Amino acid sequence: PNIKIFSGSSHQDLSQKIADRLGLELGKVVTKKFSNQETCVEIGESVRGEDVYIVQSGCGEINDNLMELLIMINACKIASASRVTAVIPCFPYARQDKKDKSRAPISAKLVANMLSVAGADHIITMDLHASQIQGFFDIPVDNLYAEPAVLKWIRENISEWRNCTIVSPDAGGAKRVTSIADRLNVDFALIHKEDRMVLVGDVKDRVAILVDDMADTCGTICHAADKLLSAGATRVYAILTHGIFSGPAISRINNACFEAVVVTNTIPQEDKMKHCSKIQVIDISMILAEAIRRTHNGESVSYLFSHVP
Amino acid sequence: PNIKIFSGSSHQDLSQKIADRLGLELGKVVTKKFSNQETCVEIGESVRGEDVYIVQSGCGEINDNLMELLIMINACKIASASRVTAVIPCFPYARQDKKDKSRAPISAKLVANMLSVAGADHIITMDLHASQIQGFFDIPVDNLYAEPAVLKWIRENISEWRNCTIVSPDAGGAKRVTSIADRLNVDFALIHKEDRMVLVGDVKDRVAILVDDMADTCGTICHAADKLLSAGATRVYAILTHGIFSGPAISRINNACFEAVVVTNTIPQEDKMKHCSKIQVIDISMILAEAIRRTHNGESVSYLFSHVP
Amino acid sequence: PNIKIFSGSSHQDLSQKIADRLGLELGKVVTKKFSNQETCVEIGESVRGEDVYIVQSGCGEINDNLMELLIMINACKIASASRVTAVIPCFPYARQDKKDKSRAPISAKLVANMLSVAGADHIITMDLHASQIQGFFDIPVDNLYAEPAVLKWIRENISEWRNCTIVSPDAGGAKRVTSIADRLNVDFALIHKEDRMVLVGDVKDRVAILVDDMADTCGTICHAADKLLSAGATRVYAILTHGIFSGPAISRINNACFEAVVVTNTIPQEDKMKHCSKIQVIDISMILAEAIRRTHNGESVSYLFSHVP
Amino acid sequence: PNIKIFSGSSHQDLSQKIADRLGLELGKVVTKKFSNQETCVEIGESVRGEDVYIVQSGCGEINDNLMELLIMINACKIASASRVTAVIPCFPYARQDKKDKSRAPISAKLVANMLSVAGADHIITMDLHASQIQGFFDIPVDNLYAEPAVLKWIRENISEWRNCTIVSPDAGGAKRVTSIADRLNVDFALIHKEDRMVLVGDVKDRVAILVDDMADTCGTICHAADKLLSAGATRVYAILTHGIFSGPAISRINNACFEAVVVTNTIPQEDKMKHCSKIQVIDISMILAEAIRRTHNGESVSYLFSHVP
Amino acid sequence: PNIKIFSGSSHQDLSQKIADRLGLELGKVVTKKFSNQETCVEIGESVRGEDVYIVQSGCGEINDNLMELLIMINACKIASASRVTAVIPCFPYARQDKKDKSRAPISAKLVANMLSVAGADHIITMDLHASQIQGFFDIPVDNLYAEPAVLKWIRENISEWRNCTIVSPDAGGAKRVTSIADRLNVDFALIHKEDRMVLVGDVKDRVAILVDDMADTCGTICHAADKLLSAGATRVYAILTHGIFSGPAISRINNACFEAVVVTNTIPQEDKMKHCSKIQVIDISMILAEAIRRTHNGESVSYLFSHVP
Ligand SMILES: Nc1ncnc2c1ncn2[C@@H]1O[C@H](COP(=O)(O)OP(=O)(O)OP(=O)(O)O)[C@@H](O)[C@H]1O
Ligand SMILES: Nc1ncnc2c1ncn2[C@@H]1O[C@H](COP(=O)(O)OP(=O)(O)OP(=O)(O)O)[C@@H](O)[C@H]1O
Ligand SMILES: Nc1ncnc2c1ncn2[C@@H]1O[C@H](COP(=O)(O)OP(=O)(O)OP(=O)(O)O)[C@@H](O)[C@H]1O
Ligand SMILES: Nc1ncnc2c1ncn2[C@@H]1O[C@H](COP(=O)(O)OP(=O)(O)OP(=O)(O)O)[C@@H](O)[C@H]1O
Ligand SMILES: Nc1ncnc2c1ncn2[C@@H]1O[C@H](COP(=O)(O)OP(=O)(O)OP(=O)(O)O)[C@@H](O)[C@H]1O
Ligand SMILES: [Mg+2]
Ligand SMILES: [Mg+2]
Ligand SMILES: [Mg+2]
Ligand SMILES: [Mg+2]
Ligand SMILES: [Mg+2]
Ligand SMILES: [Mg+2]
Ligand SMILES: [Mg+2]
Ligand SMILES: [Mg+2]
Ligand SMILES: [Mg+2]
Ligand SMILES: [Mg+2]
Incomplete structure (x- = not known):
């Protein structure tokens, strides 16, 4: 066989x-x-x-x-x-x-x-x-x-990764970010909404890395990134295993403060990369x-x- | 089975x-x-x-x-x-x-x-x-x-690798270095003895990387490194797949100008690393x-x- | 018996x-x-x-x-x-x-x-x-x-043999030419390709003698001879132990600048000598x-x- | 595997x-x-x-x-x-x-x-x-x-195969023809040379089928076919597993009396079929x-x- | 030749x-x-x-x-x-x-x-x-x-050789000792372990000669010699064709009761003779x-x- x-x-x-x-x-x-x-x-x-x-x-x-x-x-x-x-x-x-x-x-x-x-x-x-x-x-x-590949990308692409904070966009994904935070030996922060969001964990002068399984409309990660910049973060990254990017996601990402939006290639991304400069593919x-x-x-x-x- | x-x-x-x-x-x-x-x-x-x-x-x-x-x-x-x-x-x-x-x-x-x-x-x-x-x-x-691992090491350890010169210590190993030079898109130089050595290829202000299958007594690579420093090279590396390091090799390497002597671990190296700071293992x-x-x-x-x- | x-x-x-x-x-x-x-x-x-x-x-x-x-x-x-x-x-x-x-x-x-x-x-x-x-x-x-017979031919046929340079067409044959250079007490040069060839060793106003084990298509020795004439050599000889001379070798030799192409008779040469004046047999x-x-x-x-x- | x-x-x-x-x-x-x-x-x-x-x-x-x-x-x-x-x-x-x-x-x-x-x-x-x-x-x-395929060809191509005689060109191949004669329930004849050939077995008014392993120059089968026509055979076929057909074989077959020369395709036959009409391939x-x-x-x-x- | x-x-x-x-x-x-x-x-x-x-x-x-x-x-x-x-x-x-x-x-x-x-x-x-x-x-x-040389040594070095007993240290070597016992016309004894050893054959008031192919650690022959002295033997010799004498053999022999330990020179013995007085070389x-x-x-x-x- x-x-x-x-x-x-x-x-x-x-x-x-x-x-x-x-x-x-x-x-x-x-x-x-x-x-x-x-x-x-x-x-x-x-x-x-x-x-x-x-x-x-x-x-x-x-x-x-x-x-x-x-x-x-x-x-x-x-x-x-x-x-x-x-x-x-x-x-x-x-x-x-x-x-x-x-x-x-x-x-x-x-x-x-x-x-x-x-x-x-x-x-x-x-x-x-x-x-x-x-x-x-x-x-x-x-x-x-995708976590091994994500860790590899973080180490080879974010120079300050040893001082970064891994951030969950919501209470649901915290487990995932903690796993990553354990494998990198960095801090981990949570964000949850009460239209206002509350953030736990120091992020000032540190690179923040939102981590998630998927980005469909990217409202969640865009709101989280706005909050992270409010709390004094230096740069905000988003890393997702599934880049669906449906609806208004591309416009929101283009108007967001992300340094990069890294997604895996479980979903083809060539069309989205054409209209969004900051999308990167693992x-x-x-x-x-x-x-x-x-x-x-x-x-x-x-x-x-x-x-x- | x-x-x-x-x-x-x-x-x-x-x-x-x-x-x-x-x-x-x-x-x-x-x-x-x-x-x-x-x-x-x-x-x-x-x-x-x-x-x-x-x-x-x-x-x-x-x-x-x-x-x-x-x-x-x-x-x-x-x-x-x-x-x-x-x-x-x-x-x-x-x-x-x-x-x-x-x-x-x-x-x-x-x-x-x-x-x-x-x-x-x-x-x-x-x-x-x-x-x-x-x-x-x-x-x-x-x-x-070992060439894939050597190329990986060169890219992740030598910041100037795109402007480096891959150097054969002798006419015998030229094939090997050319292979590496082809995979990195860099210049390749040869060195051969006439007690004097003659070098072909510009190496001034560029990092030089001697490449070889083995280092036994390291007379060859030490003489080559002396010649490379004579010809205006900035730093000289040596990369060998087999680090035998017998006889006076450790003393010669310690007295040589190598930035690093990278060898694979086809041969155990722990004892040699104790007495030689610049040995590194792939x-x-x-x-x-x-x-x-x-x-x-x-x-x-x-x-x-x-x-x- | x-x-x-x-x-x-x-x-x-x-x-x-x-x-x-x-x-x-x-x-x-x-x-x-x-x-x-x-x-x-x-x-x-x-x-x-x-x-x-x-x-x-x-x-x-x-x-x-x-x-x-x-x-x-x-x-x-x-x-x-x-x-x-x-x-x-x-x-x-x-x-x-x-x-x-x-x-x-x-x-x-x-x-x-x-x-x-x-x-x-x-x-x-x-x-x-x-x-x-x-x-x-x-x-x-x-x-x-064939080296003893080659040395004999060089001494009895090249009047300037004491001031000649023995040249390897490639890095592979250098050993051979060095042996000959040692037995004649003359200089030895190397030539290797980077379509361009690089030559180490002074050959100006001196007779050059390419030495090799075989000539099949004679691309190697013809390119080497062109380079030797570029570098100011007076006459260029080629001495090979095996004169295979297959494919376009005879035409290339006829169009090349060799004074002579000496080969041993390990392979019959009568037919090739008919169509190539400068082939000589040891x-x-x-x-x-x-x-x-x-x-x-x-x-x-x-x-x-x-x-x- | x-x-x-x-x-x-x-x-x-x-x-x-x-x-x-x-x-x-x-x-x-x-x-x-x-x-x-x-x-x-x-x-x-x-x-x-x-x-x-x-x-x-x-x-x-x-x-x-x-x-x-x-x-x-x-x-x-x-x-x-x-x-x-x-x-x-x-x-x-x-x-x-x-x-x-x-x-x-x-x-x-x-x-x-x-x-x-x-x-x-x-x-x-x-x-x-x-x-x-x-x-x-x-x-x-x-x-x-090739015997099963030969038997198949004989049955589907020779209408009189039940009354035919299988003939060995020499004493050496008799075994083979006997095998075929056993599988078809027909007579088998032998032919051997004493420049004269002697034939044992009635072949008059019957189709004769010479059988052999190979035809190189076809002198053997052509002489056998001449003898078979001398002895009153109606048509003479030749069936060989290996159609080498070297030297003068094609001319001799063209000048021979064979109805057909059937060979297997253990050897390519397209070129020979061009110059010989009566060659057929199993x-x-x-x-x-x-x-x-x-x-x-x-x-x-x-x-x-x-x-x- | x-x-x-x-x-x-x-x-x-x-x-x-x-x-x-x-x-x-x-x-x-x-x-x-x-x-x-x-x-x-x-x-x-x-x-x-x-x-x-x-x-x-x-x-x-x-x-x-x-x-x-x-x-x-x-x-x-x-x-x-x-x-x-x-x-x-x-x-x-x-x-x-x-x-x-x-x-x-x-x-x-x-x-x-x-x-x-x-x-x-x-x-x-x-x-x-x-x-x-x-x-x-x-x-x-x-x-x-080595048996002819051993017999020669026994006759010229042991004055009582006509009344001696040839002893095998184990059941494995008995053949050898019997051969020697046949060539000298003397008694032959066996010794085998049951940490205790059992000896068959009268050895009281008689010289005993242990015979063996090799002595590596000499535990076997030392135990045999202790048993022979227990059974009333006058002197105990050991004759071996191969004197390997590795590990603790020299100390054990020095502490043993052997009159002499004769070995052939199939293995160099000079170093062992320095530290052991009773080793002799045939x-x-x-x-x-x-x-x-x-x-x-x-x-x-x-x-x-x-x-x-
Ligand atoms: N393809 C889809 N696109 C958008 N919403 C969807 C889709 N499929 C299901 N939903 C809806 O989304 C909601 C599920 O949301 P989500 O998975 O983010 O949170 P949850 O399951 O409530 O909690 P959590 O995942 O944080 O434990 C449900 O109301 C479900 O009906
Ligand atoms: N373990 C060893 N240590 C040192 N020298 C050795 C060893 N084994 C063999 N030699 C000797 O080293 C020489 C071989 O050297 P080396 O492989 O560097 O060059 P080469 O075979 O002549 O040419 P090249 O490899 O450049 O085509 C021979 O003289 C051989 O006897
Ligand atoms: N009869 C032949 N004619 C031409 N090329 C051949 C022949 N036989 C083998 N080759 C090929 O030629 C190449 C060998 O070339 P060559 O001997 O010139 O160099 P090398 O073995 O790589 O190095 P070097 O001899 O310089 O140490 C191989 O790719 C081999 O397959
Ligand atoms: N390729 C060949 N073409 C022609 N003749 C060949 C070839 N190879 C060998 N021979 C010769 O042909 C002869 C063998 O002939 P053949 O096989 O027809 O008869 P045999 O072996 O004597 O007897 P039989 O096969 O009838 O028992 C030998 O003299 C052999 O040297
Ligand atoms: N160089 C060595 N030193 C010590 N022991 C060894 C050596 N080589 C093998 N042996 C081990 O010694 C044993 C063989 O012992 P020995 O030859 O004394 O007795 P045997 O073969 O069992 O019987 P016998 O020789 O009496 O018929 C095996 O277990 C073997 O693995
Ligand atoms: Mg979620
Ligand atoms: Mg859910
Ligand atoms: Mg070498
Ligand atoms: Mg070698
Ligand atoms: Mg060559
Ligand atoms: Mg080769
Ligand atoms: Mg036959
Ligand atoms: Mg035959
Ligand atoms: Mg034993
Ligand atoms: Mg044994």
């Missing part, structure tokens, strides 16, 4: 980077639309008895990409692939992980059920919005972390490629939680 | 680093000396049907270490190991690779024959003194290169571990010739 | 010269081709209990000549010759002596293995491309040197004959490294 | 047919000549841990093709292929399988030794001239038979492909001795 | 004694260490067509001496010596001649393989620990016996010289099993 990497249409550059790191060519697949806009998928090579990995992120036209992924999984499964793995760098509907006093769907659970019923045997993803989403599955889920294709290769060879994946490959 | 890593007594720190990078514990082996100083080897665990890797460098008490390696290979082979690989970071007797108008042995060929007859199926080594030594074997030999255990893991899994090893893992 | 000299079809003039110097007639052998172009060999006399020497150079139709040599060795060995020696003035595939970051064969090692398995007990050759090729064998290899049949006679009589062969017989 | 099929330059059409029947693409390899006509081989993809099959027949420029095959085997073996198999449809030097009161080489044994020393683990060939050549190896040799690529696939999967190869796949 | 005797650095006095008995001078060889402690060997005279004997015992720095011997053998073999013989008075790793329910090497077999692959044609040794080691070779091995250089001369002249070597020359 050999590795076969297939790309959905969502993030083809990431799939190519992963394939190069694995020393493989992308599997032959046609993924287009019929005239009535139904997804058309044709696997152009035999996957019989192979270990198939389908790379598709929850970005762009999310429902189209999700249906493409489900259809590709189904096609590979009924084509007698030995194992089918969904590599989903940004998990769609992850923020709908609970009801919370509302007659709302748990869309993340529905997506997990659909992936299971399509025939996925395994899920590889990066920085799930809530790690409880792992429990939405009955198949194994490897939730990778490659995480090495982490994804190593996770694929370790799941295939039966090596430890959790080794990657703390080690940059 | 699983990976089993065994350490000879020559370089136990390197073996441990490799084992950690592989996520494995070192195999149980007793390697001591009988009273009459014959090597005693006892494999403390079953290696039947396993892929065995024995790590032993040509350093320290070279003949003792070589005999230890041969005895361990023999013990694993008659213990029904599926495959036995010798991981020899610094190949012993590599400099005796030819006769050249002398009634001399070709000791490198003798060592290759002894390794083959002991039962080695495969050799992993780093920067063979002459790559023709690969032809001394009939079994496959993977000759790894870890190459990641390259060796990746080579072991790729030979085991049937992935491409030559991928490592240009990529730091 | 008497000497029997057999000629392959590659270089019959050299075999005849060697046989005359030994006071012997060439052994009766038929070496032709079957209709389907397979080599046909028939030993026309008994070689039982004899010391057999088969002369065949790696020239012309190289694979045909090599197969002829292997077949003749096999025929003599199963005909109960006491000892079989391959006299190979120019060793085929000598330039494929290593892999060097390529998925390439080590063809020189393969040729050595084939010669050993055909039944060769001993190899006599001249100026191996790399002396490490000696280690590719387990049988003894005598690598003779006879080395005396060295080969003396080496054969000394190996037969158990006298010192290395005596020939410095003495013209 | 996957199948990798590599083509030598001798018979690229056959290699492509085999690759298509296996559902594979031919492995990336460069096989050209250096300027001095030495074979140049570069394996363009990793073969590490793979089951490598190199297809090269003993045809055309036989010594060049044989050296190409040996060099490719060596390149794959030192590139750490798990297993290397030589697929040699027509075995070179097969007719030099003995000495027989001559001081001649046993060239077939030399070729076997060279293949073994190059690193071949297994040989697949078709209709060895003498099956004793199998004993020239110590590695397994699968000698396939495809045996299915037999070779099935043999490769069965050796790879550990299924029975001898199943193919009697079954067309 | 003449005799050439070369000395390794292990036992130069023995080599000189052998050379004098042969009427020869020791061959010119340089055997030193490079700076990094690799063995350096240079044969200072032509050995072409000669019968070369290299004398090196398994004593002192055993792995260094063994590597020296292998390198010297290789140098002589590629220097076209007609025959190379290793004269190894004490065979290294002889006690590691089996595994015996342990995952241990058979180091003696490895040493034999290394000697064969270095190019040894013949082995001369004295009192192999187990004569089965002869079967570890495919080349002839002459295992000489010269066996006459046996070794006669064995060399008889192998050279084709005379019977086994003649020496019973005759002092």
